[PDB]
Amino acid sequence: AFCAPPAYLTHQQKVLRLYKRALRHLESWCIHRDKYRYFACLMRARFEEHKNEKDMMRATQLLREAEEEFWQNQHPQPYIFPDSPGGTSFERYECYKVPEWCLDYWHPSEKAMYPDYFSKREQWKKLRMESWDREVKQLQEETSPDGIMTEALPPARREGDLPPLWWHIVTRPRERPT
Amino acid sequence: FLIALELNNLTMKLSMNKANPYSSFSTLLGFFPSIIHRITPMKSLNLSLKTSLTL
Amino acid sequence: GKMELPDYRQWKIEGTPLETVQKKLAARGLRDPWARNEAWRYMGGFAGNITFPSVILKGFKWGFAAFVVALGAEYFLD
Amino acid sequence: SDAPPLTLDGIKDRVLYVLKLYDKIDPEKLSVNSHFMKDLGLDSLDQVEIIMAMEDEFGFEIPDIDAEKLMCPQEIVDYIADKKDVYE
Amino acid sequence: SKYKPAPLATLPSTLDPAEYDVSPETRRAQVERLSIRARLKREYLLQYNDPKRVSHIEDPALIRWTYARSANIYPNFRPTPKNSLLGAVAGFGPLIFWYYVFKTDRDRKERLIQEGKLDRKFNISY
Amino acid sequence: SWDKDVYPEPPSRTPAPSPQTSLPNPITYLTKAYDLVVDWPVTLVREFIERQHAKNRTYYYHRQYRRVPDITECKEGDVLCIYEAEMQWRRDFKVDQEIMNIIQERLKACQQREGENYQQNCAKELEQFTKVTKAYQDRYLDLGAYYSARKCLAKQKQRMLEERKAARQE
Amino acid sequence: GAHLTRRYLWDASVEPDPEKIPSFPPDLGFPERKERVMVATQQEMMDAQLTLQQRDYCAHYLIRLLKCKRDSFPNFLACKHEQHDWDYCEHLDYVKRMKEFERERRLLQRKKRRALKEA
Amino acid sequence: SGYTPDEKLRLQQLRELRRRWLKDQELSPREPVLPPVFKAYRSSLFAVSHVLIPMWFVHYYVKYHMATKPYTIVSSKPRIFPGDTILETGEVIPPMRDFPDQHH
Amino acid sequence: MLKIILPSLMLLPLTWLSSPKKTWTNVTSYSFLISLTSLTLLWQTDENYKNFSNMFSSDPLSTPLIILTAWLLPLMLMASQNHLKKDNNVLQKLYISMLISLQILLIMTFSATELIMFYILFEATLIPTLIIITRWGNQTERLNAGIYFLFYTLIGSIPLLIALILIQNHVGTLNLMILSFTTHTLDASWSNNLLWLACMMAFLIKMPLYGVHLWLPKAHVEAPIAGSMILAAILLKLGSYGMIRISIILDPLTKYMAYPFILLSLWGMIMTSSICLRQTDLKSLIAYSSVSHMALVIASIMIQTPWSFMGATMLMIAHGLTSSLLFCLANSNYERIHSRTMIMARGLQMVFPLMATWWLMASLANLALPPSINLMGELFITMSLFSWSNFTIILMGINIIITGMYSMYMIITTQRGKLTNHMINLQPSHTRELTLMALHMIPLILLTTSPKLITGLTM
Amino acid sequence: GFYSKDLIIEAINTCNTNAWALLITLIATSMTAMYSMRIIYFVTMTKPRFPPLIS
Amino acid sequence: FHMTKDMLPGSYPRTPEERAAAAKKYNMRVEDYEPYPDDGMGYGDYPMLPNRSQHERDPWYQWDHSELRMNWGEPIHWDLDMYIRNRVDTSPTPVSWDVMCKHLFGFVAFMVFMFWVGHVFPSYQPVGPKQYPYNNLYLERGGDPTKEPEPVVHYDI
Amino acid sequence: GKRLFVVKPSLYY
Amino acid sequence: GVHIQPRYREFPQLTRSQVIQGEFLSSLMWFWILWRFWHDSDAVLGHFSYPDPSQWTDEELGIPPD
Ligand SMILES: CCCCCCCCCCCCO[C@@H]1O[C@H](CO)[C@@H](O[C@H]2O[C@H](CO)[C@@H](O)[C@H](O)[C@H]2O)[C@H](O)[C@H]1O
Ligand SMILES: CCCCCCCCCCCCO[C@@H]1O[C@H](CO)[C@@H](O[C@H]2O[C@H](CO)[C@@H](O)[C@H](O)[C@H]2O)[C@H](O)[C@H]1O
Ligand SMILES: *C(=O)CCCCCCCCCCCCC
C-alpha cells in the first residue's frame, strides 16, 4: 500500500508470492497449529528441492505447474485478516476518515473550542505553503532524460527541504479516526 | 452430535484435507450467489444500456 | 503502564503435541524452526484437554446436587 | 477496545521476541539493525516466514510489495508503527 | 482438473500464459505502460498536494466517458441491417406481444360478462 | 353515544367468575390500582370539561335537501334542469357509499364478535352485505370515472330491457 | 411404517387407500352397529368458543380443561389432570381410527381371497 | 531486495513529519473549551413522566373518544362453560351430561 | 379567482419597483402570502364545485393543482438566488418576472372554464419557459433543448386547436360544464377516431408519452433549477389535467382508442425506469424517473375508472413535490462542483449529514414507501389496472423492482462509499438550501396525513 | 426449543405428507446438531488459535 | 470549458495517423489502443477495454479514485457503472463457471424431480379419517339451516 | 490517557 | 468494568464473578432438565401405549368369515 508496484514482477518475486499464498491456504485447511506446522515444513521442502534450478526455462515451467496445482488445491474460503481486502472489518472506518481540509469550514464558535489545536494547525499550514515551490522545483530537476518513469518519489536532498508531495501522506486520517 | 463429534476429531490427524466437489458446494453456497448475482444483474444492466438507452 | 513480556526461554516444545510433529518431521530429514513460537498455545493454563462431555456437562454436578435437595423437599412437603 | 494502544518500545519488544523464537537465528547476535540476509545469513524463503510470523503476532497483513523490502527488525518495527499510527 | 474461463468468471493471472512471458518486446511494453501511469500519477499529485488549489480536480477521462455515452452516440450511428432489425424488434416487439396478452384476456372477460358466467360477487370498487 | 339501531350490538353475557385456586389474580388488583390512579383523575378532568361545555351550549343542524325533478323528467339539452338533477344524483351516490360503509362495518364487527362462531352466527350480516352489494352493483358498477345520472339511467334502461326480453320469452 | 412398504414395493389391492376409508358398508360384519355418542351439545361447543377442529367426539373433555384453566388462573400448572383426560380421550379416538384402517385392510384381504375362489 | 538508499531516506523524513503531525493531534488539558436524589427514585420519577402522565392521556382518548363510537373497540365473546352464571341476566348454564368416566 | 390572480399580477410591479437589496425578500414573502390565500379554494363544504364566474372555476381536480402552483413560486425563487447573484439587477428582475408569469398563467390555466381559454393559456406558458431555459441555461445544448421543447409541444397543439374549433362549431360552445351535461355518444367512424387523436396527442406529448418523450430529458439537463422545478412539478401535469377534462366528450371511443397508449405507457415505464440504472447524469436520471412515473398517470387516465382517476390525481401531486425536491437536491451538489455526473461526488453523507437525510426521504418518497401519497397513488393505479386486466401486474411488478433499484442506487452512489476528498470546495449546506428541502418535504408529510384533499373528482 | 421443535417433528412423522419433504426435514434436523457442534468444537474446545496478546 | 474537440471522443479512426491521435487522446499506447468494431452503434473511437470488473483491480494499490479502483487520467471502460464493485463481478472463481452451473441446476433438478416422487408415494400413518359429529358439523361450517343436510353417521368399531 | 482531536465536518450550519 | 490487565502468551486471570455466574447458569440448566425429566418423562418417552393392529381379533373389527 505504501510502495508502488514495478512494471513487472521478477521471477523471484512471483515464486515468493506463491510461497506465501500456498502456506496461507495450507493454514486454512489445517486449522490446528501442530498440523499446520507439520505441513508447513513439508511445503518448504518442495520449494527447496528446486531452489537451485539454473535452467530458468525449467524454473519458469516449474512455476507454471505449481500455480496450476495451487488453483486446484485452493481453499474455497481462505482465512482473511479482518482489516485486509475481503476481510470483515475492511473499510469499516472509512465513514469516519474525515479529511483535514474540512476544518477550513468550521465556524469560529467551533474553532474557539480548540484554541490550541488550531494554533498548531496554522503552523502546519504555514510550513506547507513555504515548502511547495521548492518541492515542485526538485521534482522538475530530478526528471530523468529518457522517458522511463516510475511512481517512486525522491527524498529531500538539501537542508530545510521537505520531501516532495508529503502533505497527503503526513496529514492523512488515522486508521482508527475517532 | 456423534457424527460431527467424530468428523471433527479426524481433523486433528496429520493427513491433508482435499477439496471434494460436495464440500465446495456447501462452502460456496451451492454456487447460487456466484451465478445468479453475476448473470442476472449483468444481463439486465446490459439491456438497460445497450437496448433501452442506446438503441 | 509498560507491558512486560514473559521470558522467551521458557517456550520449549517438550511434552507438547509439537514434539510429536518434530519426531515425524525428523524421520524425513526436516525440522520446524518455528515450533517454539507456537509452544505457548500448548503449555501453562492452555495445557490440558477439553473433552466434549466436559463442555456439555458443565454445571451438572451442582445441578444434580440441587436436584436431590429439591426432590427431598417434595418428598416431605407431601 | 480493551487492548492497550501500541507503543514504539512495545512493538520493538514483540518484534524481537518473535525472532528470538526462530531456531535459524541465534538470539545473542540479534539486534534491531541485524540485516536478515547479510548479518543473519537467511535466504529469501526465510524472510517470507518472518513476515508471516509478524502478521500472526500483530493480527494484520503486510502486502507483498511492502513485505519484500523489510530486511531488518527495525524496518519491521517502523512499518508496523506507521500502519497503526504509533508515534511515541 | 483444469480451469475453464467464462466471461463472468475470468482467467486468473497466475494461470495466464501471457503473465509468464519475458520477451524483451513484452517487457518494453510493460515498462512503457508504467511510464504513462507514472506521468499521469505525477500530474495528479501535483494538483492534489498544491496548497493553492481552491477547487476540486478536473477529470478529463471522466468527461470523455460521459461524453462518449451521450452526445457522441448519434453522430457515430449508422443505420445497418442489424441496427434496423434490432431496433424494430426491440422497439415494437414487446408492444405487439403485450397487445395480444391484454386484448385476448380482456376479450374473454367481456365474453363471460355478457353471458353471465363471470362471478362478480362483492366487487363494488374499480 | 350512537344509534343502537343503526349499529346494533348484542347484549353482553359475562360469566361469574368462580375462582378455584387460592392464588390472588394479578389482573384484579392491577385493575383496582388502575381505576384509582388512572381512571379516577381522568374522569374529574372530563367532568370539568363537560361542565364548561354546558355553560356555552351551542347547537348544529343536519341539513335537509328537498327533492328536485329527476333526470328522467329533464328535457335533453336543458342544462338548468340537468344540473339540479345531476347534483341531486351526486348527493344520493355519496349517501349510497356511506350505506355500504355501514353494512361493511356491521359485518366486520360481527365477525370479530363471533370469533370461532362467525361462520354460523354472521349469517344475517353476511346476507345483508350480499343483498346490499347486489343492489349497489346494479346502480353503479361500470359507470366509469365520469359517472352521472344520465349514465346511471342508461345503465338501468339497458338492464330493464333485458329483463323484459327474458320475461317475455318465458 | 410397514404399511407403506406393503402398499408400495408390493401389491396394493389388499392395502387401504388412505382417502377411500371406509370403502365397505358399515353394517358389513356388525349386526346392530351402534352410532357413536356425542356428550357435548352444539350449544355447549358454541358457547365455549371451540374451534371447528376442536369440535370432535372428545369436546366434552376439552370443555372441562378450558373451564379449569380459567378458574385455576394464575396457577397455570393446576390443570394436569384435565389435560390428561382430554389427551386420553383423543388417544382412544385415534385408536378407533386405527381400527377402521385395520378393518378395511382385512376386508380387502377377504375380497381378494373370495374373488380367487370365484374364478 | 530491501529499500534503496533513497527509499530509506524518504521514509525517514516522512516518518519524522508524520509522527509530529500525530503528536499535534493531541488535545491540551483545557480543550475542548466548553462554556458552562437516590436510586429507585430515578426509577420512580421516570415512571410518573413516562407511564403515569401518558397513561392519563391515552386513557382519556380511549374512554371518551373511542369507547363512545360504534365498533371502535370490538372484543370477541368470553367463553361460557356448563355451570356458569351470567351476570347481565343471572341465568345459570345447565351442566353437561355423563360420559361415563374412564380410566387410563 | 380574481383575489388570487390580481395579487399575483402585483408581484410584477413589486419586482420592478423594489430596491435591488429588497427584491428577493419582497417577492418571496408576498409569494408565500399568495400561497396562503389559495387555500381558500379548499373550503369545500358540499359537492357543488365552485364556479366564480363565466370564466373561472375550481373543483377538486384544479384546486390541488392551483395550490401546488402557488406554493412552487416562492420555492423557485429561493432556488434561483444563489446562481443569479452574479447577474446584474435588471437581469435578476427579468428572471423573477418570468417566474411570476408562469405562476399567473398556470393558475389561470387550471381555473379556466372554457377549452380555447385553456388552450391559449396552455400555449402561452411556452414563452416564459423557453426564455428561462435558453437565456439562463448553462450549456450550448440549451438551444437545442429549447427547440425540442417548443416544437414537440407545438406540433401536437395544432391538431388540438383544430379539434377544439370543430367541437365548438358542432356544439356551439367550449364551456366545460355544458359539454359535460350535453355530451352524446360518438359514432366509431374513422373521422371520429382522428378527432380522438387530435384531442389527445398534445396532452400525451406533454406528459410525456413514451416514444415522444425525448424533449423532456433534453429540457431538464439544460434548464436552470427553477425551470426544472416548474417543468417537472406542474408543466407535465397540464397534459394529465387536459386529458381528464377533455375525455368526457370522447366516449365510447376511448375503450378501443386507448390500447396503443396503455401499451406504450405500461411497456414504456419499464424502458425509462431501466434507463435510470445506467444513466451517468444525475439530472437526466431524475428526468427519466419522471417519464416512468407519468407513464402510470397516462395508463390510469386511459382506463377511466374511479380508482384510476383518484390514483392519478394523488400521483400527480406527489410526483410534483418529490421530483421538484430531487432536482433541488441534485442542484445543491452541482452548485459546488459544477458537474451533473452522478459518479463524480461520492460519500457525501460524510460532509453533508443533514442534506443526506433530505436525500434519503426524497428517495424513499420516490420509490413509494407507504403510507406516503406517492405509494397511495401508485397503489390505487395498480388496483385499477389489475381490474382492467390481471396481467398488468406483471409489468407493474417489474417497474416496482426497478424503481427501488435506481432510487437506492442514486443514494448509495452519491451519499455513501468513501468521500471524494479532492473536492475541498464542498462548502457546508446553506440555510436557504436546507430550508428549500424542508418546504418540499413538510407538505408531502402533511398531505400524507390528510389525503382527502388530493383525491380528485371521483372520490 | 423442545416445547416447539419436538411437536413439529412429531407432526411431520404422523401426517399425510410428501415423503421427500419428510426425509430431508429429518436429515436437516440432524444436520442442525452437526453445525452446532461445529461452533462448540472449534470455538469452545480445542487449543488457542488467536493472537498472543490476550485482552 | 477545457475540452476542445481534439480532446473529446470522435468518430471511428480510419487511418493509422488517426489511430495514433486517438491513442494519445485517451492516454494509451498505440499498440494497446483499439476501438470497437465499426458497426455504427455510436462507439466512435472510444477505446474497447478488457471486460474485467473493478473487483479484479489490485486492492492494495492506492488508487486516485479509491472506490472505483481507477487512477486519474486512465481511460474508463465503457461499462464502468456496470462493473463497479457494487455491481457485476467477473473475478476468477475457485470452480469453473460451467461446473457451478452444472452442479447448481443438477441439485435443483434432482430435488424438484424427487419432490414429485414423494408426492406419488406419500407418507401417512395407518389411521382412518377423522370423524366429526352432527353431520360433520354441517351447521357450524355455515350450512343453510333450512335445508336438511345429507346424514353422515359414524359408528363405534 | 491521551485525548486526540476528532476531525469532523462543520456541523454548525 | 474492572480493568483486567492484558496478558501476553499466558492464560489470563479470571474474576470470581464471571466464573460463578457462568457456573450458576450451567447448573440451572441441568437442574431444570433433571427436575423436568423426573416429573414429565413421558413427554420424552411417550405416555400412551401404541396398539399392535395385528393382534386385534376379527370379532373386534367385525370381519365376517369368508
Ligand atoms: C420504439 C421506437 C421504435 C423506433 C424505430 C424502430 C425501427 C427502426 C428501423 C427503421 C428502418 C428504416 O431504416 C432506414 O435504414 C436506412 C438504411 O440506409 C437509413 O438510411 C440512411 O442512409 C440512406 C442512404 O442510403 C439515407 O438516404 C438516409 O437518410 C439515412 O438514414 C434510413 O434513414 C433508415 O430509416
Ligand atoms: C434449584 C435451582 C438450583 C440452582 C443451582 C445453582 C448452583 C450454583 C452453583 C454455583 C457454583 C459455584 O461453584 C463453582 O464450582 C465450580 C465447579 O464446577 C468451580 O470451578 C472449578 O472447578 C470446575 C470443575 O467442576 C472447573 O471446570 C473450573 O475450571 C474450576 O474453576 C468454581 O471455582 C466454583 O466457584
Ligand atoms: C411409517 O410409519 C412412515 C413414517 C415415516 C418414517 C421416517 C423415518 C423416521 C426415523 C425414526 C428413527 C428410528 C430409530 C430406531
Nearest-CA distance K98 → chain A (Å): 15
Give the residue whose CA is nearest to atom 3 of ligand 1: E91
| Kind and range of the H or E run holding J53 | strand J53-54
Q: What b/e sequence results for E3-32 when a residue is b if at least 16 CB atoms lie within 10 Å of its CB, and e otherwise? A: bebbebbbebebbeeebbeeeeeeeebebb
Q: Hey, how many other C-beta atoms are within 10 angstroms of the C-beta on I78?
A: 19
Q: Contacts of residue A23 in chain C, CB cutoff 8 Å?
A: none
- CA of L10: which chain I residue's CA is closest? I428
Question: With an 8 Å Cβ cutoff, are E4 and K31 in contact?
Answer: no
Q: Which chains touch C (3 or more CB pairs under 8 A)?
A: A, B, D, J, M
How would you classify residue C30: left for phi > 0, otherwise alpha for psi between -120 and 50, otherwise beta? beta
Out of K82, K101, K107, closest to residue B46 by CB: K82
Task: Please name the method used to determine this structure.
Answer: cryo-EM
- CA of M64: which chain G residue's CA is closest? G29
Which residue stretches of H1-104 are H helix?
A: 5-24, 41-47, 53-61
Q: Contacts of residue H31 in chain L, CB cutoff 8 Å?
A: 3
Query: Ligand 2 center to residue C62 CA distance, Å?
Result: 7
Question: With an 8 Å Cβ cutoff, are K39 and E11 in contact?
Answer: no
Query: Ligand 3 center to residue B22 CA distance, Å?
Result: 27
Query: Ligand 2 center to residue M24 CA distance, Å?
Result: 7
- CA of H14: which chain D residue's CA is closest? D82
C-alpha cell at B47: 439491456
Asked if residue I339 lies in contact with residue I346, where contact means CB atoms within 8 angstroms, the answer is: no
What is the tally of helices (H) and strands (E) in chain I?
A: 20, 2
Catalytic residue among D9, D13, D26, D43: D43
State the best of B40, B48, B51, B52 to mutate against chain E, taking most chain E CBs within 10 Å.
Answer: B51
Q: Contacts of residue A41 in chain C, CB cutoff 8 Å?
A: 25, 30-32
Maximum distance among all Cα pairs of chain B, rounded to whole angstroms:
62
What's the reported resolution, in angstroms, to a tenth?
A: 2.4
Q: What is the dihedral of CA E83, E86, E88, E94, to 10 degrees?
A: -160
Out of A114, A152, A163, closest to residue H32 by CB: A114
- CA of B17: which chain A residue's CA is closest? A29
- Would you say the CB of residue M4 lies under 6 angstroms from ligand 2? no
Give φ, ψ of E9 to 5 degrees: -140, 95
Bridge partners (DSSP) of residue I112 are I56
Q: Compute the Cα dihedral for I295, I298, I304, I307 and give only its sign.
A: positive
Q: Distance (Å, rounded) from C-alpha I198 to C-alpha I165?
A: 11
Out of E8, E9, E73, closest to residue B54 by CB: E73
Q: Which chains touch J (3 or more CB pairs under 8 A)?
A: A, B, C, D, K, M
Nearest CA-CA partner of I143 in I151, I134, I135: I134
Q: Distance (Å, rounded) from C-alpha I24 to C-alpha I22?
A: 6
The residue count of chain F comes to 170
Measure the CA angle with vertex F74, ends F71 and F76; round to 5°.
105
Q: What is the dihedral of CA I441, I442, I448, I452, to 10 degrees?
A: -120
3-state SS, residue A155: coil
Mutate to test the pocket of ligand 3, among K123, K124, K125, K127 (most ligand atoms within 8 A of CB): K123
Measure the CA angle with vertex A142, ends A141 and A144; round to 5°.
115
Nearest CA-CA partner of E64 in K31, K63, K77: K77
Asked if residue I265 lies in contact with residue I257, where contact means CB atoms within 8 angstroms, the answer is: no
Ligand nearest to the CA of G3: 3
Query: Percentage helix, strand, coil, to 5, in chain G?
Result: 55, 0, 40
Asked if residue I153 lies in contact with residue I205, where contact means CB atoms within 8 angstroms, the answer is: yes
Q: Distance (Å, rounded) from C-alpha C78 to C-alpha C74?
A: 6
Could you confirm whether D43 is annotated as catalytic?
Answer: yes
Asked if residue H56 lies in contact with residue F42, where contact means CB atoms within 8 angstroms, the answer is: yes
Question: With an 8 Å Cβ cutoff, are J53 and M8 in contact?
Answer: yes
Question: How far apart, in Å, are the Cα atoms of A99 and each of A85, K7, K30?
Answer: 22, 32, 39
Mutate to test the pocket of ligand 1, among E82, E83, E84 (most ligand atoms within 8 A of CB): E84
- Domain boundaries along the sequence of chain D: 3-88
Give the residue whose CA is nearest to atom 16 of ligand 2: M23
DSSP calls for G42-89? HHHHHHTT--GGG-STTHHHHHHHHHHHHHHTT-TTTTHHHHHHHHHH
C-alpha cell at A65: 505447474
Q: Distance (Å, rounded) from C-alpha F87 to C-alpha E27?
A: 89
- Would you say the CB of residue M31 lies under 6 angstroms from ligand 2? yes
